[PDB]
Write a protein that holds these residues in place. Structure first.
Motif, PDB file in Angstrom:
ATOM      1  N   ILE A 104       0.863  -1.163   0.000  1.00  0.00           N
ATOM      2  CA  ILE A 104       0.000   0.000   0.000  1.00  0.00           C
ATOM      3  C   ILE A 104       0.910   1.226   0.000  1.00  0.00           C
ATOM      4  CG2 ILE A 104      -1.904   1.135   1.187  1.00  0.00           C
ATOM      5  CD1 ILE A 104      -2.348  -1.900   0.302  1.00  0.00           C
ATOM      6  N   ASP A 105       1.112   1.827  -1.168  1.00  0.00           N
ATOM      7  CA  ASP A 105       2.024   2.963  -1.330  1.00  0.00           C
ATOM      8  C   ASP A 105       1.262   4.237  -0.960  1.00  0.00           C
ATOM      9  OD1 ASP A 105       3.596   5.028  -2.243  1.00  0.00           O
ATOM     10  OD2 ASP A 105       3.885   4.185  -4.252  1.00  0.00           O
ATOM     11  N   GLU A 106       1.693   4.933   0.088  1.00  0.00           N
ATOM     12  CA  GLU A 106       1.013   6.131   0.584  1.00  0.00           C
ATOM     13  C   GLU A 106       0.970   7.244  -0.460  1.00  0.00           C
ATOM     14  OE1 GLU A 106       2.635   7.579   4.225  1.00  0.00           O
ATOM     15  OE2 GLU A 106       1.502   9.466   4.193  1.00  0.00           O
ATOM     16  N   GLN A 107       1.875   7.183  -1.435  1.00  0.00           N
ATOM     17  CA  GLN A 107       1.905   8.171  -2.496  1.00  0.00           C
ATOM     18  C   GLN A 107       1.071   7.796  -3.707  1.00  0.00           C
ATOM     19  OE1 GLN A 107       3.341  10.253   0.049  1.00  0.00           O
ATOM     20  NE2 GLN A 107       3.462  11.327  -1.915  1.00  0.00           N
ATOM     21  N   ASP A 108       0.353   6.694  -3.600  1.00  0.00           N
ATOM     22  CA  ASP A 108      -0.490   6.202  -4.686  1.00  0.00           C
ATOM     23  C   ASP A 108      -1.954   6.616  -4.472  1.00  0.00           C
ATOM     24  OD1 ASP A 108      -1.857   4.644  -6.583  1.00  0.00           O
ATOM     25  OD2 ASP A 108      -1.212   2.723  -5.713  1.00  0.00           O
ATOM     26  N   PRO A 109      -2.532   7.406  -5.381  1.00  0.00           N
ATOM     27  CA  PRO A 109      -3.947   7.772  -5.209  1.00  0.00           C
ATOM     28  C   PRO A 109      -4.869   6.560  -5.168  1.00  0.00           C
ATOM     29  CG  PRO A 109      -2.916   9.247  -6.771  1.00  0.00           C
ATOM     30  CD  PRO A 109      -1.913   8.153  -6.491  1.00  0.00           C
ATOM     31  N   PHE A 110      -4.451   5.431  -5.732  1.00  0.00           N
ATOM     32  CA  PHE A 110      -5.276   4.234  -5.760  1.00  0.00           C
ATOM     33  C   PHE A 110      -4.788   3.201  -4.746  1.00  0.00           C
ATOM     34  CE2 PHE A 110      -6.051   5.044 -10.575  1.00  0.00           C
ATOM     35  CZ  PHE A 110      -6.881   6.087 -10.258  1.00  0.00           C
ATOM     36  N   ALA A 111      -3.993   3.615  -3.768  1.00  0.00           N
ATOM     37  CA  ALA A 111      -3.491   2.707  -2.758  1.00  0.00           C
ATOM     38  C   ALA A 111      -4.581   1.878  -2.121  1.00  0.00           C
ATOM     39  CB  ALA A 111      -2.754   3.480  -1.667  1.00  0.00           C
ATOM     40  N   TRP A 112      -5.721   2.512  -1.863  1.00  0.00           N
ATOM     41  CA  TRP A 112      -6.836   1.870  -1.160  1.00  0.00           C
ATOM     42  C   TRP A 112      -7.942   1.476  -2.125  1.00  0.00           C
ATOM     43  CZ3 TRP A 112      -5.207   1.048   3.628  1.00  0.00           C
ATOM     44  CH2 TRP A 112      -4.216   1.891   4.128  1.00  0.00           C
ATOM     45  N   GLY A 113      -7.580   1.274  -3.385  1.00  0.00           N
ATOM     46  CA  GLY A 113      -8.538   0.922  -4.413  1.00  0.00           C
ATOM     47  C   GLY A 113      -8.961   2.100  -5.267  1.00  0.00           C
ATOM     48  N   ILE A 114      -9.488   1.771  -6.435  1.00  0.00           N
ATOM     49  CA  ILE A 114     -10.141   2.728  -7.316  1.00  0.00           C
ATOM     50  C   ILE A 114     -11.626   2.787  -6.918  1.00  0.00           C
ATOM     51  CG2 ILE A 114     -10.787   3.150  -9.719  1.00  0.00           C
ATOM     52  CD1 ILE A 114      -8.217   1.567 -10.440  1.00  0.00           C
TER      53      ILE A 114
END
Lengths: 308, 308
Positions: free
Chosen positions: B298-308
């Motif tokens: 779960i990359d904290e810098q990823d807008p989709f870390a927690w799913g789309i």
């Protein structure tokens, strides 16, 4: 149990499964020969990774290979649940980000050998990855097509590595929760283009549609319909290259200037171009993020070990 | 990056993602209270595991929890890409096989606490897992329904934990490559049952259809249509329990005798029953196989870390 080390990532929502270890050794000298080996000798490995239960229709797989070209970082072979691919823009970004994550490469330029030629990717210090896309151009502009249930809309016909019909004014809501409506609209548009004899150069079928709309946080947001009635979760590399060609041809975007293209999911690419005669040279910059570091487990006692 | 340790498996083709570590600590005393906590306080964790890019429509997730009951091996909470579930037969087999693989349990009986009560599973020395299913019965037999495009067919109406319409003679090819045709047929059948006022006891809607055919390697092969127009890749635990009730009621299968039920994918369950008044007590035995031991990232810098 046999083990396959994979790194799963996504590029603006478009997923890649990178196989780092566990496939059979390939002996071909060229990447094309190595792809033939996978397909002819080792196809169960693709199937284990891409068919149910481990894969699905949206996933692209990528096999990491040692480089063939003297100036290459590595080779890669792309595949999906149906068979083998040629190039894969989103998967190339996934590859490079994954190798960075594993400490196998550092920022800089990386040439990647594929079965159909070399691609050039630059990994930036901040993790963004710029890929040089193929020479792109607009073929026709503001072309009328009558879409049943909707009437006439106009779009541009442009090449970015695929043939696209690009539409600004379609009256549709470009939001992810409206994707089913957008899918039906764009599929009807593709059929109408065909019926009305609207093609790319030399009669080439237009097999992608991109719809564009204003966005409060980017220069534009798109919806991209692809073969197989599938939408791209990302802004689409070839589709954004085609968009750059249309912006260039209209005078909307200058050489070297950044265009920020959002997707149906809200992910973004940056695009820039330079001029090369009657074509532009597009550069697409995006990011991939890791989603899993996995050991796929192939149980020899499982009838579905190699896929359903 | 945050890490979630998951074991992915399948039960006759029906997949389970078991979360072993990385979700927030739950403080509720009962499994029902713990499910409420996940849903109300921690729902992004389900989403990270089940939405795109990491999940899809077929996957069921399961959170491993410490036991609540004094006699329980563990607790579990099931969920999918839409929300939280109650019980999950295939996921319970996946749970038990996964804990065996990780060396957390050994063969024997294992009581599993769920948000809606306890389930009993026996792990055999050879890895097969027997689950006691709910009391089952046939309500009506050889009931006529006119399916448009096909005419009248007859089926049994039976309860195995869900209401099923079970059809032997349907004229359809029960093979995986025919699944689209079977999906349309069974969905039309479900609608025809409703239109013709054919229900379970006390007016309960029949929301599953099972088709049966001879098989050279089992007693029968099925196709099982479920809510949401989804087919079960496995023989279906509740559906096979309903089948046992019909076999019992016809005198086809004796108490304690084994029935081997194959699925649309060719996976198999064994079923047996005993008598309890006007119900039978069904026992379903199946296997789960591991498909991946993964660290979701779960990359904290990823807008989709927690799913789309």
């Amino acid at each position: 149990m046999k083990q396959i080390h994979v790194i799963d990532s996504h590029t603006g929502g478009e997923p890649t499964r990178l196989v780092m270890k566990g496939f059979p050794q390939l002996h071909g000298r060229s990447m094309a020969e190595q792809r033939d080996e996978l397909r002819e000798l080792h196809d169960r490995w693709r199937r284990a990774c891409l068919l149910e239960p481990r894969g699905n229709d949206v996933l692209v797989g990528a096999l990491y290979c040692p480089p063939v070209s003297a100036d290459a970082t590595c080779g890669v072979i792309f595949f999906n649940n149906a068979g083998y691919l040629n190039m894969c823009g989103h998967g190339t970004i996934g590859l490079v980000a994954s190798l960075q994550h594993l400490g196998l490469i550092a920022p800089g330029v990386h040439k990647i050998d594929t079965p159909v030629g070399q691609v050039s990717a630059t990994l930036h210090e901040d993790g963004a990855i710029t890929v040089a896309n193929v020479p792109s151009y607009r073929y026709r502009q503001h072309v009328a097509v009558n879409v049943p249930g909707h009437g006439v809309v106009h779009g541009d016909i442009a090449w970015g590595g695929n043939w696209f019909f690009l539409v600004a004014e379609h009256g549709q809501r470009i939001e992810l929760d409206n994707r089913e409506v957008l899918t039906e609209y764009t599929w009807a548009m593709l059929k109408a283009l065909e019926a009305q004899g609207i093609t790319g150069e030399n009669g080439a079928p237009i097999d992608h549609v991109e719809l564009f709309a204003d966005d409060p946080n980017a220069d534009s947001r798109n919806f991209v319909m692809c073969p197989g009635k599938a939408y791209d979760r990302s802004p689409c590399g070839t589709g954004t290259s085609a968009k750059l060609a249309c912006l260039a041809a209209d005078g909307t975007l200058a050489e070297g200037q950044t265009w920020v293209q959002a997707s149906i999911t809200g992910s973004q690419f940056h695009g820039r171009y330079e001029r090369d005669g009657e074509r532009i040279r597009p550069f697409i910059t995006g990011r991939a993020h890791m989603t899993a570091d996995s050991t796929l487990l192939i149980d020899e006692q499982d009838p579905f070990a190699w896929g359903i």
